[PDB]
Write a protein that binds this DNA or RNA. Structure first.
Ligand SMILES: [Cl-]
Ligand SMILES: [Cl-]
Ligand SMILES: [Mg+2]
Ligand SMILES: [Mg+2]
Ligand SMILES: [Mg+2]
Ligand SMILES: [Mg+2]
Ligand SMILES: [Mg+2]
Ligand SMILES: [Mg+2]
Ligand SMILES: [Mg+2]
Ligand SMILES: [Mg+2]
Ligand SMILES: [Mg+2]
Ligand SMILES: [Mg+2]
Ligand SMILES: [Mg+2]
Ligand SMILES: [Mg+2]
Ligand SMILES: [Mg+2]
Ligand SMILES: [Mg+2]
Ligand SMILES: [Mg+2]
Ligand SMILES: [Mg+2]
Ligand SMILES: [Mg+2]
Ligand SMILES: [Mg+2]
Ligand SMILES: [Mg+2]
Ligand SMILES: [Mg+2]
Ligand SMILES: [Mg+2]
Ligand SMILES: [Mg+2]
Ligand SMILES: [Mg+2]
Lengths: 185, 56, 48, 171, 159
RNA sequence: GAAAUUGUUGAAAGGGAAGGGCAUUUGAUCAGACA
RNA sequence: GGAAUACUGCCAGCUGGGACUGAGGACUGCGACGUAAGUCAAGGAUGCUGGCAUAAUGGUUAUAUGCCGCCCGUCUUGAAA
RNA sequence: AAGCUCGUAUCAGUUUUAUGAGGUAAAGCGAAUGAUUAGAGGUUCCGGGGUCUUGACCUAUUCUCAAACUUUAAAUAUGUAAGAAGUCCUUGUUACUUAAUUGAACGUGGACAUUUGAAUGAAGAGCUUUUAGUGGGCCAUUUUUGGUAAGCAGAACUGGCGAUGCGGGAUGAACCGAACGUAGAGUUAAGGUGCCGGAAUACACGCUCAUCAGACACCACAAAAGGUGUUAGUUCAUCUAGACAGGAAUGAACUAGCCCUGAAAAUGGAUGGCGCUCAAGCGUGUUACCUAUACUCUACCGUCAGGGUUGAUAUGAUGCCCUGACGAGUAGGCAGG
RNA sequence: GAGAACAGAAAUCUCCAGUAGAACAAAAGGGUAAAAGCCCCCUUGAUUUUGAUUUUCAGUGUGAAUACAAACCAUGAAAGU
């Protein structure tokens, strides 16, 4: 007998492979598995883990977010790395001449980057140019902006959104939401 | 038929499965309940020292 | 650091037995538990 | 177990107010030194305001019998707890050493009064120097001049299950 | 039925000490409390306003607010399997400065003094407290201190 | 042309149930390698 | 006064008998013995020899012997009931 | 169950040091409150008989008490602190505050590195979403209420059973020991070693004879009171100056060991059975020996964790391989077949 | 307790002693003496607006209670309340 201090046979709780069956995604995983093992560069370890993430854990990154990150002092000539999809944003009227490496580019996002003099490359092209992530800049999109998040932690005095189908005057604005009807929250 | 009324048996063992968590401490705690007169002046004081550092 | 480096020792039961009919009394009262001072050496070498 | 006799010397812990406290000694019968030191604090706490955490053991030494091969008459005073009350008792034991007499005493108390080790205090053990100071007849009967007695009805030991003759108890 | 009022079971807790009734001495009102100070809570039975609940008797907290005749104190309370933050508004009669940390301030001061004293010549200033250590060897003299023999005493009634 | 259930023949066991688990004796029966 | 012995402890002192186990499968490591070449009990068994080559070992099955084994399912604090 | 952010940061059903809180155990009543026994000395234009007594207070003493009394006051539990979000030197902001550049709060700049501020440990720490079953419990030690009591009813802390086999208690949900992948060897636990039955009809000092002996925790019951049964012990007296009975010890009153009396139920009967008497009984001491699914070492299966390896010309990089640890399970969840 | 016509154990007056043995709407427990008790004077803060906090607690509601902010007032020589 052993007086165990922790739960036995516990899984690590982290993904070690993509859930997808995409054949081309598995090739990228194989490429960066090799690089992470034999380069001892922290960039390769981060990229390999990012390829395992699910869809909600890889929110899109717009070109306006990319342009703002290139305005950082001394970051104007770095290669922006996005492990996910890059989307177009028409709210910005000027774009720099950077190079962006991403898994996917939308049709609008690719056109805007190219017409500004830049280039769009894949992650295997990036590994050829920067095998150890030289002069790179990793950008991640917002996770808590997802609509499902605003319902989490619902309760009194919490200020979270209720799970409701129809919104209007007669839908969950009576007793419990104002002092004139019993009480407020 | 009469049943049991109350007991605390097994409750501490349940609480120690994942519980007894010391509260997480944050720098810059919330100013809820602080005197309103102090907070009105503290807001003006912070605006003044923000301009001085920016214009320095 | 030196002591924590060593893994907890895994000993067997004593080869010649415990020398008492009932272990779970104090060594002073003819049992086995408690502080037995230098007599621990005889017990450990039997279990090693 | 097999008893040994130790002298144990202890003291109170030195303080600035009272440096060099008094040294107290007593003779303890025990099977080892670990039990002997435990017994020392047990009796010391019955006589002085002191305990193990407030004192220290100065020296423990085994005491050997001066003439272990000489037959001696011992007088022993004991105090023991019965099932209801506490009593004092004087007994006489004939042996060749103090430890031998004490071992006999504990056996005698267990057999005749059902007194365990924890219920017995040894007050004093002293050798009786002269005849006619022995006051117990079961000891005095062995002090007669030219003592002789036979051992009737000898029972011999057999190492085999079956014997081929009727045994004899002659001696 | 059962009774669970606000001051239930506080018969002895909120009593004044023996021969210590009457008005509060002035030193209670002259002490200054600042945000971040560590105070301990002990209710005074003669001041019925701003009095803490019986749970917080004997608890220690940190000041977060200062008002005209009272201070705000933060207490961590264990509810279920976690701790919740409680904020109390207590008059100064029911609180006092805690010495659980005032004694710690001087150790910080002495550590800086010892560090600077040995900075020019010494290494390994050893600014860490250590537990009580086993005693070293010593020699006990018997000159004028010959050991006195003791024996167990017989049973006596002396009622 | 299955099972429950039944007849005949053959083998075995049976002192107030029968059936089962571990191990081996005895009887019957059987695959594998002869490189 | 000089020894012995008992008791307790230590030896990187020596040596006899018995039982269980042989996982791994080119080399690589740490050591030992040696002037050297090399050797070795040093990161897990090899050498020699006999009988039989089939129901002999073994499997299956029936039976016998030793010890053990209460009727499943279900409700229940609790079921062989 | 799905993971996510990170990679020892920080945390702990623990101790220590420093500093708080409490009114229970105990204790106390010539200390308060309330109960309560007995005298003694005093007091009346202020109780009543009688010309001196009983009551009533006063003072000093005395015996005994309290869950809803108390001056005092533990043990065990319990709050906080032991640094970088820290300490120190200088001086910026404001509509708050001060007689006042006084203070408060928040900042700029400089100085002090991990013996950086006790111990020990840390199959890593932090965080989020979602959903199953359950919401009749019961038992043991200790504390504890009602009741004569109950295998009764009701609480407190912890450990168990339920949900759990295995060795021991003959037998048993809860006791003792110990928790379970498949095997081999060795050693033990609790409990045992006359035979059933694996293991000393071992050793040692005593005690006990029952015409109803006794024999091992939980546990399967026995009391008050007695015995010149036997054993040991305590106190007093007699006795060398001859006691007791009719030439050496004796008498009286007591204490507690075993045994005996006290001891009466219904089918035949149970220290488990046989049986056992300087025990195979009781008390105690020393050794040897027996055996659990526990411990130690080895092999094999699986699970989890940390790692190595894409270079063609040979097939699975979900591949192959190296290293360490782990394996009980009802309701229920998930995974591979 | 010691005194004063009617006046007595209890009417009114005076002095002394008096840690609260009184009083504070009510049950009980706390608390209180130049007061929280008794008497006298002045008053309506038992008012307006809307938040935070404590207790029961799911950290929901209801009841009750605590500390401030912004107004307008009461009282007092004033600090204050
Ligand atoms: Cl329960
Ligand atoms: Cl059989
Ligand atoms: Mg219920
Ligand atoms: Mg052996
Ligand atoms: Mg044993
Ligand atoms: Mg009020
Ligand atoms: Mg047909
Ligand atoms: Mg058929
Ligand atoms: Mg065969
Ligand atoms: Mg069989
Ligand atoms: Mg059989
Ligand atoms: Mg059976
Ligand atoms: Mg039922
Ligand atoms: Mg059943
Ligand atoms: Mg109480
Ligand atoms: Mg008491
Ligand atoms: Mg139900
Ligand atoms: Mg019931
Ligand atoms: Mg059930
Ligand atoms: Mg039994
Ligand atoms: Mg046998
Ligand atoms: Mg015996
Ligand atoms: Mg085993
Ligand atoms: Mg296991
Ligand atoms: Mg399992």
């Amino acid at each position: 007998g052993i007086d165990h201090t922790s739960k036995q046979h516990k899984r690590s709780g982290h993904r070690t492979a993509p859930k997808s069956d995409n054949v081309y995604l598995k090739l990228l995983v194989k490429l960066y598995t090799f690089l992470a093992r034999r380069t001892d560069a922290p960039f390769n370890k981060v990229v390999l883990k990012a390829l395992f993430l699910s869809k909600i854990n890889r929110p899109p990154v717009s070109v306006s977010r990319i342009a703002r990150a290139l305005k950082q002092e001394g970051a104007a000539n770095k290669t922006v790395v996005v492990v996910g999809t890059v989307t177009d944003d028409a709210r910005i009227f000027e774009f720099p001449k950077t190079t962006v490496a991403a898994l996917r580019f939308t049709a609008g996002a690719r056109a805007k980057i190219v017409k500004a003099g830049g280039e769009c490359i894949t992650l295997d092209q990036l590994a050829v140019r920067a095998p150890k992530g030289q002069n790179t800049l990793i950008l991640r999109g917002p996770r808590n902006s997802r609509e499902a998040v605003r319902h989490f932690g619902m309760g009194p005095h919490k200020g979270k959104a209720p799970r409701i189908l129809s919104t209007g005057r007669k839908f969950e604005r009576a007793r419990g939401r104002r002092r004139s009807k019993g009480f407020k929250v | 038929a009469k049943s049991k009324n109350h007991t605390a048996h097994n409750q501490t063992r349940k609480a120690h499965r994942n519980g007894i968590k010391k509260p997480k401490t944050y720098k810059y705690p919330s100013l809820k309940g602080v005197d309103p007169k102090f907070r009105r002046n503290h807001k003006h004081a912070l605006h003044g020292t923000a301009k001085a550092l920016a214009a320095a | 650091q030196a002591n924590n480096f060593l893994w907890p020792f895994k000993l067997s039961n004593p080869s010649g037995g415990w020398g008492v009919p009932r272990k779970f009394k104090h060594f002073i009262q003819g049992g086995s538990f408690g502080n037995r001072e230098e007599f621990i050496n005889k017990l450990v070498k039997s279990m090693n | 177990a097999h008893f040994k006799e130790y002298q144990v010397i202890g003291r109170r812990l030195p303080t600035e107010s009272v440096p060099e406290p008094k040294l107290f000694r007593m003779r303890i019968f025990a099977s080892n030194e670990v039990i002997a030191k435990s017994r020392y604090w047990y009796f010391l706490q019955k006589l002085h305001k002191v305990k193990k955490a407030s004192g220290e053991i100065v020296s423990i030494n085994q005491i050997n019998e001066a003439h272990p091969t000489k037959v001696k008459n011992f007088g022993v005073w004991v105090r023991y707890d019965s099932r209801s009350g506490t009593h004092n008792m004087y007994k006489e034991i004939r042996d060749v050493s103090r430890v031998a007499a004490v071992e006999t005493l504990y056996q005698d108390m267990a057999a005749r009064h059902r007194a365990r080790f924890r219920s017995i205090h040894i007050l004093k053990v002293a050798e009786i120097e002269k005849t006619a100071d022995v006051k117990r007849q079961y000891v005095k009967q062995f002090l007669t001049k030219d003592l002789k007695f036979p051992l009737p009805h000898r029972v011999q030991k057999s190492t085999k299950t079956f014997s081929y003759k009727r045994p004899s108890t002659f001696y | 039925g059962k009774s669970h009022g606000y001051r239930s079971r506080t018969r002895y807790m909120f009593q004044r000490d023996f021969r210590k009734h009457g008005a509060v001495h002035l030193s209670t009102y002259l002490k200054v409390y600042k945000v971040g100070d560590i105070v301990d809570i002990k209710a005074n039975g003669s001041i019925q306003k701003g009095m803490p609940h019986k749970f917080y008797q004997g608890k220690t907290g940190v000041v977060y607010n200062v008002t005209k005749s009272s201070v705000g104190v933060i207490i961590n309370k264990m509810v279920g399997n976690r701790y919740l933050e409680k904020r109390l508004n207590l008059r100064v009669e029911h609180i006092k400065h805690s010495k659980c940390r005032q004694e710690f301030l001087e150790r910080v001061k002495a550590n800086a003094a010892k560090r600077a004293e040995a900075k020019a010549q010494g290494v390994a200033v050893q600014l860490k407290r250590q537990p009580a250590q086993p005693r070293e060897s010593r020699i006990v003299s018997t000159e004028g201190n010959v050991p006195q023999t003791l024996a167990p005493v017989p049973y006596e009634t002396f009622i």
